[PDB]
Symmetry: C2
Subunit: 246 residues, 2 copies
């Protein structure tokens, strides 16, 4: 029943985006995370130290493919999120697909407690979206006037974000090709709400010890089956995987 | 820089053990763990629910190849460890390699607080080893007289286990082909002490939510680079990976 995987194909830079194409239509929520062999999402508080050149390339590619990059406010602070950068070629490829030159950032926050002074607001070509709750969207909107478009993402409960609404709120604005880069709380919610369509997961060839949290924190305990779409590798032993529900 | 992995080879039951051969000589500490996509070592408190037929086959194969299966006392209680089972063919293959018919169990405990009444002692063809500290080995030996061989595995500190000594204590008894199936505390220590030579890691195609701990718990924060030896897959989307230091 066991098949050996090995490298069968060098991926030209035209095929690589094909591997990670979004659906032709409909909203697609893709997560991109990196994890150590032993399930560690962080080394020294962030994921950067595991992100080798291979993973950075895939990471930037996924951003390049996305209409919007949805990120929890914690990751935004902790990983020092600034505006998405798109090089001339990235922009070109994006226009070629009928996309804006750079994807937007969508910051998710139930609290609304974002400061006017954050790199996501400051070092950014496009103003980011703030995805938050009906309860606090208005004050958040005013407090962040000029910096971000604040979007109420409550479903039935005006005090929380309904992650399915979040997704539709983005799609409603033509940001249907969604990428989230976390964090683990945010990813946890996408998981619980069963709105995660896709997990792109870099498995870094490291063990990091027990201190690190996983790429998904929270109280959720689901058992969402996903399908292995592909696994890529490089010379450094990284596995760049792509899993799709269900 | 990116190569697509795909199934290039169906593994006959003779090749599969070759993929997981132990070195011809020297002690080798191999860990076998299963993890969800999102780094969850457990579903509902144990790893069983992620272990499909593919993973059970590999798991039993690794046991089959091992001279001894080293397991922390917590995993022994929590996963209801009983004696290792070896079928007639498993035994045959083991004898063919000059190995005993079934590998031994080695239970690791710093405390020594094992009960005479445990399935590891009761439903077992071979009495298991108890790998513990110099400080408590004697009382442990007496309290477990008839049930287990108690082995002092302290290095410089008689109050703790030195995991390198643990490994040598097993090798000294001709149990040099070591497999550990955890748990995460135990694996954490193997990692910190840098004695883990190999991680066989099943990546189950599931996301499980944030509740689960990783396959490595503890305060350790290392960055041990490992080399991807192989990745196998089955029809169910499982990745059966084998990583080797360094
Ligand atoms: N290995 C990787 O791939 C990876 C990727 C990203 C991050 N990380 C790491 O994980 C760590 C941070 O974890 P984190 O959980 O705090 O990140 P996070 O999910 O980005 O931040 C959590 C916060 O974002 C908001 N949020 C998340 N989900 C929400 C939801 N469904 N509805 C409303 N708000 C939501 C909340 O903000 P409010 O409190 O304002 O309501 C929440 O407190 C960092 O160290 C980071 O480096 C790792
Ligand atoms: N996904 C997987 O592959 C996998 C595999 C195995 C287990 N698990 C799960 O993880 C959970 C249990 O975790 P756990 O950390 O408690 O398991 P564990 O490592 O087997 O048990 C911990 C205990 O074993 C002893 N121990 C471990 N390392 C030691 C060392 N270096 N020196 C001396 N003693 C040591 C200690 O016993 P004393 O307290 O007596 O000193 C320690 O308290 C279970 O739910 C289990 O299902 C998952
Ligand atoms: C590619 O650059 C970085 C990317 C990330 C996050 C991240 C990195 N890799 C993957 N596969 N998923 C992610 N969500 C984190 C970083 O450090 C915080 C980075 O800087 C090196
Ligand atoms: C194969 O049978 C089981 C194995 C395990 C532990 C385990 C399972 N799979 C892997 N890859 N590593 C491990 N350490 C755990 C189990 O449940 C506790 C099992 O029963 C189904």
């Amino acid at each position: 029943p066991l098949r050996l995987l090995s490298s069968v194909h060098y991926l030209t830079d035209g095929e690589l985006p094909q591997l990670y194409d979004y659906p032709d239509d409909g909203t697609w929520l893709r997560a991109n995370f990196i994890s150590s062999l032993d399930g560690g999402a962080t080394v020294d508080g962030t994921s950067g130290a595991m992100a080798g050149p291979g993973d950075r390339f895939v990471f930037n590619l996924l951003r390049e493919l996305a209409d919007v990059i949805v990120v929890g406010v914690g990751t935004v602070r902790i990983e020092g999120y600034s505006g998405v950068r798109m090089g001339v070629v990235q922009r070109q490829h994006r226009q070629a697909r009928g996309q804006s030159e750079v994807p937007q950032l969508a910051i998710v926050t139930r609290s609304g407690r974002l400061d006017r002074d954050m790199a996501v607001f400051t070092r950014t070509e496009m103003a980011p979206l703030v995805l938050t709750t009906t309860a606090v969207a208005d004050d958040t909107r005013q407090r962040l006037a000029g910096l971000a478009e604040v979007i109420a993402c409550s479903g039935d409960d005006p005090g929380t974000v309904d992650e399915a609404v979040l997704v539709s709120q983005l799609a409603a604005r033509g940001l249907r090709r969604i990428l989230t880069e976390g964090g683990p709380t945010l990813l946890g919610t996408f998981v619980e709400r069963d709105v995660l369509d896709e997990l792109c997961l870099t498995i870094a060839p490291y063990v990091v010890g027990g201190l690190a949290r996983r790429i998904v924190t929270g109280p959720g305990q689901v058992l969402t089956r996903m399908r292995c779409a592909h696994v890529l590798t490089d010379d450094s032993g990284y596995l760049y995987t792509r899993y799709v529900k269900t």
